[PDB]
Amino acid sequence: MAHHHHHHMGTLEAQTQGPGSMNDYKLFRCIQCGFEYDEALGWPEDGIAAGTRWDDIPDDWSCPDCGAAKSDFEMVEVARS
Template sequence: MMRYMCLLCGYTYDPEKGDPKGGLVPGTDLATAPREWVCPRCGADQDKFAMRDDDDDE
């Protein structure tokens, strides 16, 4: 699955891990996440995320 990075704070959303605190179970792609989900670090909306094109682990 493709990972996504918040363009405002640099947080990387990894669909394999999800965001359990934010209500996204592992395996949830950001493209199918509820629109009310926001960046857990800075609160940015999903439209502030971009797909990452690398495979670097964080």
């Protein structure tokens, strides 16, 4: 009769989120879903490099999360002070 059991390992923090805000970068949050973009973090999945400004981001660029437009983003001030 088997009496072996497994235990849950718990939480492995694989995120480690934290962009170094050494320069005043902004946040841009999609209003259609809540996708928050940090200019200091960038989005390497699309090719957006860390430090790329919203102005440098192509007008044809869409929210990688849902395909919402740039006008679907809000400019969020960074309270990391």
